[model samples]
Target: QTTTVYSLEDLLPYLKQDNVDVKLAPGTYNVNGFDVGEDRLFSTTPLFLFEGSNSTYDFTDVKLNINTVVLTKFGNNEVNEIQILGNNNVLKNLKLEDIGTTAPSNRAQSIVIDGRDNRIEGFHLTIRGSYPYGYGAAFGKGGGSVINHRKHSGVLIRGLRNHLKDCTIISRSYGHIVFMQAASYPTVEGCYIEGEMRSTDDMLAEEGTGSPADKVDFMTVWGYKLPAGYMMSLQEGGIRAYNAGTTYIDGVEIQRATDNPTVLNCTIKNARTGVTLAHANGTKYVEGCTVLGCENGYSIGSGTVVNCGADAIYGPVFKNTYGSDKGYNADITILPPSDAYYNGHDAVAYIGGSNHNLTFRSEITEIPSNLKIMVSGDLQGLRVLHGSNPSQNNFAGTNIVLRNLTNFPVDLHSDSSNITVTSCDTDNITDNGTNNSIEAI
Candidate 1:
């Protein structure tokens, strides 16, 4: 079960063997074509690494160039290069690239992990292929719409206890850098994720409808579309952590909790949101993360944040629309929000959690004059503060704390209680709720 592979001939058979240790030669191995397997979702089974367990595949100095044109003959473009299906596997020190002919959008991923206790370290993935598309799902318009298609993301973690360490992901189209779904204890640290997206107006002039809202698509989800100069998300985020219902570890069912995923020491650039704790029933914790030139910094549902910063834009995001390296030069500025303002959403951070608990200790450098944080959904135990002069902040929660604020007003909903505001230098404290008091501390 322990062997060394110098060619594809020796590696393919050993991939299906359990409890195996396979080491590769230090060279560039080019895969011209691959075998397509069963139909999964909308994609066929993977071509390269698929269905393995309790194995270690070491590629310290190896490079794999998986060409997309190989799947052209099979008439199946939704095929992954690496689709893992087992647990306790280690795939490290490898470089995977999609260096083949460019294909259409909405293809499968390049690396997809579906097992638990897997570690992918020192890994590098470069996704290179793109085409014209109208808009993204950020406007809430991309269900089955024409512009709802895009290439697969760079990496997808869908298993428990999975970790991606010291990796660099490069995306060339409208897709997420990393997407974690149906997974628990997923951790990503010391990673760099960068994307290349265009402004909504520019895309509309080419192949888009430029409509305010898609009328036919899920009438309830309207008003979430790009208004103007909104710098559409392209249906992508730097990191998306999610969970479905429950998770089974080692055949034992474990109940899901709010604090499951953790993202640390990561840098996200040129994306809609830096880190997203999206799942309502699930929670995430972030530390020491830096998000630059994004529409919004942190999109939260329920979680704890420490030492994070995001430089948002003033108006109509995606003015540059370049890659992450050459990102736009904009941050959330003190600008008004209206039809004539032409500026993006003024909030650097957003909280849209219904019955969600959040503890945000974020240090915002340039709190916009319009708003600091925006709240939409009902929240519980909501707390926020800027170190210096604060902007207009809105809150709606129980046991809330809006401390050390100055210069601007704080809005509390009618149902709020046990609210505390200390060192506050604002006279316009609008409390639409009950049992809210402001005292000198």
Candidate 2:
């Protein structure tokens, strides 16, 4: 049977009922009107907690506006607005918005799911409010940051066999939009994620303006002062996956690593990384995904990426996280950016792995003159003092094959060996390595 609810007070009892269908009356509701009592004033209790299995919640035209004042009332712990703790539940078509610009006591999140076999679909979320909002990770991210930031992430997915589909997230905050931790067999499909972008030159111009960078003489988490000409995302990631996390279910804490994550048909823009899933275990499958105007594109370890596209507007289209990765295969089409290129790393792709097959196809006629496909070792575009060691970027055992419908050059590092390249329409191959083969037609 189906039940219709008018207010949150009437809706509370229905959330824990199994085999039930509940629909809220379509209207805008304010979160501050609920009297959660004094004990919950400083607790981590979410505004809406769904604990029922085998349920469907239809919030077709419901809009819940969360006041930012509630953030400060939660004290120094992380606050979650909506949390799902039951299996086999479906919550669909809910619009959530943060109505003010008050930073939380520590960190705040819009939605968190920690249940198996659950799905949250067709949701619209507009995220706002965080401490030190303007600059993203330049001052710092965690305890190592120059600025002590109160972060606000959009959605966190945990547990096993959870799915998030067809959701749109417009993030104006300083944390990850959609991230996964300790999840197994999770699927994220048909989602659009957007974040704000800024340039380092614009941040460096903030010197003496009492900004976070100006306060400490521009010392960054990279262990160096801020430099110019690099574009950065004010928020963190578009869709990122981590290996390990800790979550509580039924008052018992469980910690585990992520495995077999699948991301399909998603578009991400203006974030630090588009889709990074190298830390997860098992087969990471990413297909039909597009990334534009991001600092970095796809970074995966030993995965299969088919029919994916990324524009090299800010950073490389593909980057290798570690040199030990093997059996990686990718067939990506490079697209031209609509905006002017702000790519600080003059490389189109940075590839370093063993037993890998990469194919690049593009139709753009004119590309930046300094941009080249780098094979391994130290790249020219990496001028910053980040702590990435030189050995990690080695391209000793890589094999590359490029189908350049557009004329782009390939630069092989001195440490790379046993490499092969076959190109069409251009013969621009610079080999500084050993035992390589090249063919141009």
Candidate 3:
């Protein structure tokens, strides 16, 4: 049955009914000055909770604004604006915004999914409240953060077979835009996510001043002084997956690891990382995504990435988190940066792992002289004083077949072994590695 609801109070009953179609009235609903009743007071309850399974909630032409004061009124608990705890439900076409500037006590979020086979599509969210804003992870993210952080992520998917599609997010917070935890077979497609970016040189300039970076003497979470020429996101990642999370299913909280995450056709701008699925297990696949002005593009551990593109305006086009990863396959094209390059690493790509098949193609004619395609353990760029350690970028026991089509030079490290390069158009191939075959065609 289809029900046309006028207010949030009338819309609550239908959310708990199965197989129902509920539609909100076409108007702007501001959560401020609206009473959530006495029972929900001082409790960790979401503003809108969808508990019914096999339902569709249509909010087309409806705009919902949640006040940030709601985050603090819920005591010290984590507050969520909207939470979906049902299976096979679709919530689509809503314009949700977080108003006011009150930071939460610990953490908060716009939306959280804890049900199987649910989807949120065609939604537009404007996130705007978190502690320690304006600086990215340079201060810290978790326990390593110099300042205590009260995070507010945009969307957190923590269920099986859940998907977020065709959504747009304008993130002005200190957390990730779209992140997954304890999720399996989760998919995010056709989404546009954007966050603010700041240069490390600008952060370093805050030293001797009264900025947050000055308080710590510009010491980053990276265990060194913040380097110059690097651009970092004021917020966090575009699409990130964590290894473990805790979720409530059937009123019981359970902890599990994420698996089999797929991201496709998404465009991300000015975030810390574009798409990082390295922590997840089983078939991490990313395709047709475009990332620009991010610290790093794609990092999938032992997975497949096809037809993806990223610009090395600020950081590397590709990065490997762990050197122990094997059987990684990727076919990525380097896109031209819209702005001038502020590459702190001075590397177009950072390749690691063992027994990988990597292919890079770029049509841009003019390449930066400082930027090179760095293999493992090759510290030939700026900030080599605090570059990756030998174990982090180790290429030992690696057997890689690379097809490089870019104009950037390739630097093979001495730790790399049994690497075969084909179709490389770069005239400068600095081969210090062992048993490397380079063919220029």
Of candidate 3, the 10-residue stretch with the lowest lDDT total is: 379-388
- For every candidate in turn, the CA RMSD to the true structure comes to 9.1, 2.2, 2.2
Query: What lDDT would candidate 3 get against the real structure?
Result: 0.84
Predicted model with the maximum lDDT: 3
Poorly placed runs, candidate 3 (over 4 Å) = 33-44, 250-252, 378-391, 394-397
Candidate 1 lowest-lDDT run of ten: 320-329
- Which residue pairs in candidate 2 collide? 140-145
- Candidate 1 per-residue C-alpha lDDT over 1-441 given as tens digits, one digit per residue, 9 for 90 to 100: 558889865677777778888898888987654433243211334666645678898988898776656434345456566777778988888988877546533466777766688888888888765333235443332465433443556788766788888898877655567877667778889988876545655644533343433433312123332334556444377787654534444545544532378889888766656776645234456777876655556644445556665554522111111011110111222222221221245433332213333333323343456543333222111011221111112333454454533333455556456555453344545556567567654
Candidate lDDT (C-alpha), each: 0.55, 0.81, 0.84
lDDT of 2 by residue, 193-228 (tens): 999899888988988898777999887766678778
Mind giving the per-residue lDDT tens digits that candidate 3 earns over 331-380?
98999886888887778888877888999999988888778887786543
- Name the runs in model 1 displaced over 4 angstroms: 33-44, 71-73, 104-106, 130-134, 138-142, 146-150, 204-225, 245-259, 280-283, 314-343, 350-368, 375-396, 404-418, 423-435, 438-441
Count of backbone collisions in candidate 1 = 9
Each prediction's TM-score against the native?
Answer: 0.71, 0.94, 0.94
Give the RMSD in angstroms, all C-alphas superposed, for model 2. 2.2
